[PDB]
Each structure stands twice: as structure tokens, then as C-alpha cells.
Ligand binder design. Structure first.
Ligand code: NAI
Ligand code: NAI
Ligand code: CXF
Ligand code: CXF
Ligand code: CO
Ligand code: CO
Ligand code: ZN
Ligand code: ZN
Lengths: 374, 374
């Protein structure tokens, strides 16, 4: 009774930076060719969504943000072959077109159809499916999950197990997969190694999960909020350090602790200074450091290249290095086989209508992941 | 008839920065415990030696520089077990103590006994074996090969094949192994890939040799001295570009030429700007860039960490990543089995007494490697 028709529903519109989300009626157009309209069931509150509000991450406004989510297909456009109405799905903020040089490469996942490098805030065809107060509203990363209904391109959606608990597996759409894959796929943490994880939010906890699953012997959590330490130890940290407790720079502290530097370090905050600190604390001849956190837009860091000349490796990744459409269904299957846990990441549950309360919980430092239910 | 007693011989002493070498008589003390005194046979002129003259590379002066060489053992100190008088040897500017955490690691080579991170300019025991006009003269990287005789610690020397042609395999002591290993071992260049090599001197030509040996389909040489292009194509470059010929920045040019970025790039010059350019020109989702050139002392570069977050890998290495004492004898043995060629790197052969002329050739852009013969 809605297929082929405009849907009127509620969404959280961000009209301007540094303001609350506005929950209002929007019109959602029906899917065009190779597009999928999804009834949202659950969406997580990720720090990257907050970066849009704060201006850290620039994308066209007004916008419907949200990118970590799960829902049920309401209708499909012409030509769609990979999902059907009623299928459980996870939208993919990094697409998998399957046809570009990255999608065809054995290791890359930053598909050239992404909307991150040069954000337009549209569908792949350059237009919007959202209207509000007579105005077109932009999409975000081709997902826009802060809405009861969204429309995504087929290359930005993955079908998942029909028995999946959507209020939990939405985290596989961003936070969990990003952190876990950064450890197991990007760094390729080795058995018995020493790791340092800077930032113990949802993504940093998922990095710790991956480091533990890879068999690391020591996992040192680093955060300026000591209230984060208890959960970090629960999921695998052997030790936690607060840089504010020390008179020396923390890279010196970590270097003494690891008897000359860690095997693998991870920046999971989004600060230029901690990216350089994390690189410095890995062992100078063979350490690996992975940037996961997103820094403020268009800001350069300063570093001494002799840190690399001695033998260090420095890399970054989006979405844990996972090719999104291949990997998301396998990760859900793994969760359904109890190969990893997601409950440790979920600290709060709220109805979607309280999205602003959910963001203030994140900003206050109190929450890890708040899951919003539609 | 020289064992146990001081040797008078000629050496090229650098008394202060930005002066010609002074060829004069020095006194070489006999080797102490676990030290080796070597009669030099041939030594190459590497840009890193010129960095000492210019002050780009800071090390205590006055000094006997030189680190790319081959010679014959004159006498050994008490406790030496890995070489004997009469053995052909290559001094190692990166030692291999075999006992530190790096030496025991399967993939590291920057031995913690190195004299590069905080140069002292001495033997491992903190003293000098060189005297000139009654003044003590510092060592360089534990090698000091610009002398008819030098003394090195046993962890800084490798025994090589008794049949080795010393006037060619001296390049295995630095330039060739550094460039070749940067490609085959550090970058791990793959068959069919596209490579970009910035700097077509002795080390950059060896990088090209390594990329070709690894089966790269395209190898783009980058140099502002177009006189370097002919030799670069001889050893494997498919094409060469001079940044001064373009109105656009060269990372944009290389990205367009490679239809979206190269698989592997190498900075083999020693400039901060080309380090960042070489990183930018590799493919944003899966490219790898290796820093080989040495930056000027105590200078930081500036870069956008979003270059790494998209998926690039940035790394550096000393001596091609080779564990020095294990690898140098195998590389000589490989040379002897005709596995690679060294003659294309040698453009000039001069007597040791013409060391200053050899440096003038390097500074003028005319030479690749000048080999000095004693
Ligand atoms: N590369 C990718 O694909 C993705 C990147 N991100 C980015 O990952 C980063 C982390 O995201 P979340 O875990 O959701 O954020 P979060 O805000 O929940 O966790 C950040 C943690 O860093 C701590 N912290 C802040 N400043 C610190 C400092 N100077 N030193 C030590 N710790 C500090 C905070 O106390 C906090 O616990 C964000 O920048 C996010 O935008 C998130 C998902 C995907
Ligand atoms: N990582 C390691 O273990 C080692 C590092 N090195 C360093 O490698 C670098 C290269 O050494 P060599 O091949 O002996 O030096 P070289 O002086 O023979 O070659 C440098 C080349 O770079 C070119 N060049 C200079 N400025 C340029 C610019 N702005 N843009 C493009 N090209 C430019 C020059 O024309 C020249 O052909 C040096 O910095 C050396 O100190 C050398 C050996 C070992
Ligand atoms: O958190 C989800 N996506 C992120 C990926 C890194 C750039 C900012 C957006
Ligand atoms: O060229 C030989 N050794 C180099 C290695 C990199 C730092 C400067 C010295
Ligand atoms: Co996210
Ligand atoms: Co050298
Ligand atoms: Zn693609
Ligand atoms: Zn060692």
C-alpha cells in the first residue's frame, strides 16, 4: 500500500551546524532504478554523526544524517536483484559497486562511488529523495538512517540473515566492523603481540575485541576519561593509562612500558596530536600504527619523517578495511554463530524521538553506543 | 707485520662542515676485543656522505666518513669469531648484534646498537681508533671507509665470498641493497603493478631494478635532472617525467597517468615536499609509499592524515629492510650467480686520492656512483 508512492514520515533533520536535530515530517520519494527504500528499525549514534553537527566533518546541509543502522526493505526500484521487500538489510556508508579499480583489488574497500571524498549529499544519480518544508534535504554518505524511511542505492545496501536482531546488528554497519577490522584486517595483529588503543569509545572497544581475537598478549587502553577503563578491561584490555596522570608525554610512557615500543598502535579518537603520539609509541623498526579516528576537516598534522625511516608502517582505513557488501552479511552470520559479542558496546537504548538526548549522552562522555528504536 | 701495532695510512678527513675532504696521514689503532681492522679496497660515494659535508646529516666532527665499501681483514681483536685475517668483508652501516629485540624479530633490521639515531661517532666502546695531527677523529656509522684502513666492531662487518669482485660489490654495502630491498622487501612490489620512483640516483636506480625484478608492468621515473632518464630506462623505467615540465603539481600528473594513482611509490631524494607528493600519488585506497631518502636534520613535514584514512600505507626503511649481517653475504652470492647487475650504477672509477673530484661529480649531477679505488 506504499510501493510506488511518496511516503510521509518523520526524520531528524539537521538544518544548521551546532544546533539540535529537528524531528519533523519529510516526504520520501519512491525508489528509482537500482534503488532501495528501507523502513528503519534501529540506528546507532556514532561520533561521526556528531562530527557533522560540530562542523568537524563537512557535508552539504540541510541533511538527514545517520549511517549505522538496520531495517527492512519496504520497496525496490527497477533492476534491483540483491534484496527484496521484507528482507532485513544494513545500509553501507561505504558502497561496493563491484566495478571500480578498488572494488576489483584484493585488498582495498574505499569504493570510488563513495560520497566522502567530494561530498554531494545525494543519491548516485545526483538528486535527493527527501523533501521537507518544501525543500530538498541532502543525504549523508548515501545512507541517511535518521529517518523512519530512507532510500539508498543498491550498491549501498546488504541483505542479512532474516533472523538477525536488528537492534544489535546495526552496529555491524559501522562501529563494530570498523574497530574489529582495523585490528584483524588492516593492522593484522599477531598472536602474542603488544597493542596500544587510543580512544575507548565504541570503535576503540571494537579494536580491543579484534586485538584479543587475534591473540595479542598485551592490550593497553589509552583514554583521558578513566570512566571508560572498566569496559575496556571487560572486552580485553590488560592495562589502561590516562595521559593526564603523567608528567611525561604518553608516547614515552608507552615506550617504557613495552620495553621499546608496541607492535601495533591504533588512533581511534580523531585528533592530530594523538595520531602522531600513536605512531611514535610503536616500535621504531617494525611497529605498525593504524589511524581510525577522523580528524577535523582540512587540518594538517606535523611529524618528523625519521619516525618512518627507521622502519615504522603508518596506515589508515575506512570501515575496518572490509569490502562492505561482501563482508556485512558474513559478519552478521558470525554474530549469529556467537563468534563475537555486541552487547558490551550498547550502554543506552532510546526511542528515535529522543535522538537529541542520545547525542547529549555521547557528548557528556557517559555512553558508548546508544541505539535508537523507530 | 702490522698486527698489534698502530698503522699509518692515508685517509680523507672532514675537519668541519662545507669544506673539501683533507687527504692526509692518520694513525689507526689496532683492534680491541671484538673489533676488526680492515684494509680498504674500494668505496663508493653515496649522497649520505655528502649530507655529512653539507650538514644535512648531523654527526660529530672531525670525522672519517664513508660507509659503502669492501675490503680485506688485516687483523682481528680478541674474541672475534665471524671473520679472520685475509677474509673479504663489507662493513655494515647498520649493525646486526643478533641479541636485541629488533635483531630477534623476523621482520626488523634497525639494530638498537646503530649509531644513526643519536650519533656518537665512536666505536661501540665509546672511543675512537683514529688520530690525525695528534687529534682524535670520529667514526661514521661505525664504518668510516674513506681511509686505507679502518677499525669496525664485529657486529658491523660481514664476511663475503673469497672470490668477490670488491670494486663492484661494495655497492651492496649501501646503495644497491637499499634501493633493491626497498622495492622487493619493504614495499613488496607485485607483478603487474605500477610504480613511481622519485629520484634517479644510485639508490633510485636500484629501486627501479627491484621493481622490475618483482615484475612491475609500469615504472615511472621522476627527476628534475632529465640527464638521468636514459640510464633509468636502461635498468627498467617505462617512462620518465620531469616535474619542471608541468604546470600542474606532479602528484596530479602521476595520478592521471596511472588512471587513479600508482600501486607503489618511492621517495628516494630526501626532501619533505617529495615525501608528501610520493604519498599522494599512490592510489588512495590501497597504494603503498616508501620513504628512502633522508630528510634534513630536525625538520618536520606537514600532511593531511585523510591521505592515510582512505587506505594508503606509508612506511620507511633503512638499508632496504635487510638484516645486514645475514643479507649482505647472500646478496654478494646472488650477484655472483648473475641474479642482478651492478655495472649500470657505476659511472666513474677514480683513485681514492681524487675523492673531492668524485664528490664534485655527484654534486654537479653528472655521476650515479663513483667508486674510489685504494
Ligand atoms: N575510519 C572509519 O571508518 C570510522 C572512523 N570513526 C571515527 O572514530 C573515532 C571514534 O569514534 P567513537 O568510538 O564512536 O567515538 P567516541 O567519542 O565514543 O570515543 C572517543 C574516545 O576518545 C577519548 N578521547 C578524547 N580525547 C582524547 C585524548 N586527547 N586522549 C585520549 N583519549 C581521548 C574520549 O574520552 C572517548 O572515550 C571518531 O573520530 C569517529 O569519527 C568512526 C567510525 C568509522
Ligand atoms: N634509507 C637508507 O637506508 C638510505 C638512504 N639514502 C638517502 O637516499 C637518497 C638518494 O641517495 P642517492 O641515490 O645516492 O642520491 P643522488 O643524489 O645520487 O640521487 C638523488 C636524485 O634525486 C634528484 N632530485 C633532486 N631533487 C629533486 C627534486 N626536487 N625533485 C625530483 N628529483 C630531484 C636528483 O637530480 C638526483 O638524481 C639520499 O637522501 C640518501 O641520503 C641513501 C642510502 C641508504
Ligand atoms: O563513521 C562512519 N563514517 C566515517 C568514515 C571516515 C570519514 C568520516 C565518516
Ligand atoms: O647511506 C647510508 N646510510 C643512511 C641511512 C639513512 C640515514 C642516513 C644514513
Ligand atoms: Co560511524
Ligand atoms: Co649510503
Ligand atoms: Zn567500487
Ligand atoms: Zn641488534
Amino acid at each position: 500500500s506504499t510501493a510506488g508512492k511518496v511516503i510521509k514520515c518523520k526524520a531528524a533533520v539537521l538544518w544548521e551546524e551546532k544546533k539540535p536535530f529537528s524531528i519533523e515530517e519529510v516526504e520520501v520519494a519512491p525508489p528509482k532504478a537500482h534503488e532501495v527504500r528501507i523502513k528503519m528499525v534501529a540506528t546507532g549514534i556514532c561520533r561521526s554523526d556528531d562530527h557533522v553537527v560540530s562542523g568537524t566533518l563537512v557535508t552539504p546541509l540541510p541533511v538527514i544524517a545517520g549511517h549505522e543502522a538496520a531495517g527492512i526493505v519496504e520497496s525496490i526500484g527497477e533492476g534491483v536483484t540483491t534484496v527484496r521487500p521484507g528482507d532485513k538489510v544494513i545500509p553501507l556508508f561505504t558502497p561496493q559497486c563491484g566495478k571500480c579499480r578498488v572494488c576489483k583489488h584484493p585488498e582495498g574497500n574505499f569504493c570510488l562511488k563513495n560520497d566522502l571524498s567530494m561530498p554531494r549529499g545525494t543519491m548516485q544519480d545526483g538528486t535527493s529523495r527527501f523533501t521537507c518544508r518544501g525543500k530538498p534535504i541532502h543525504h549523508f554518505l548515501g545512507t541517511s538512517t535518521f529517518s523512519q524511511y530512507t532510500v539508498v542505492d543498491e550498491i549501498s545496501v546488504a541483505k542479512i540473515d532474516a533472523a538477525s536482531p536488528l537492534e544489535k546488528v546495526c552496529l555491524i554497519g559501522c562501529g563494530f566492523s570498523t574497530g574489529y577490522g582495523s585490528a584483524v584486517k588492516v593492522a593484522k595483529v599477531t598472536q602474542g603481540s603488544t597493542c596500544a588503543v587510543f580512544g575507548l569509545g565504541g570503535v576503540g572497544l571494537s579494536v580491543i575485541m579484534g586485538c584479543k581475537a587475534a591473540g595479542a598478549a598485551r592490550i593497553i587502553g589509552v583514554d583521558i576519561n578513566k570512566d571508560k577503563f572498566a569496559k575496556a578491561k571487560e572486552v580485553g584490555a590488560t592495562e589502561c593509562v590516562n595521559p593526564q596522570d603523567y608528567k611525561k608525554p604518553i608516547q614515552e610512557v608507552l615506550t617504557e612500558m613495552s620495553n621499546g615500543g608496541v607492535d601495533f598502535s591504533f588512533e581511534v579518537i580523531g585528533r592530530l596530536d594523538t595520531m602522531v603520539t600513536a605512531l611514535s609509541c610503536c616500535q621504531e623498526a617494525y611497529g605498525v600504527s593504524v589511524i581510525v579516528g577522523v580528524p577535523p576537516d582540512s587540518q594538517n598534522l606535523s611529524m618528523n619523517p625519521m619516525l618512518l625511516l627507521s622502519g615504522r608502517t603508518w596506515k589508515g582505513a575506512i570501515f575496518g578495511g572490509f569490502k562492505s557488501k561482501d563482508s556485512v552479511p558474513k559478519l552478521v552470520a558470525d554474530f549469529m554463530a556467537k563468534k563475537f559479542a555486541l552487547d558490551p558496546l550498547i550502554t543506552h537504548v532510546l526511542p528515535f524521538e529522543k535522538i537529541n538526548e542520545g547525542f547529549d549522552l555521547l557528548r557528556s562522555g557517559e555512553s558508548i553506543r546508544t541505539i535508537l528504536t523507530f
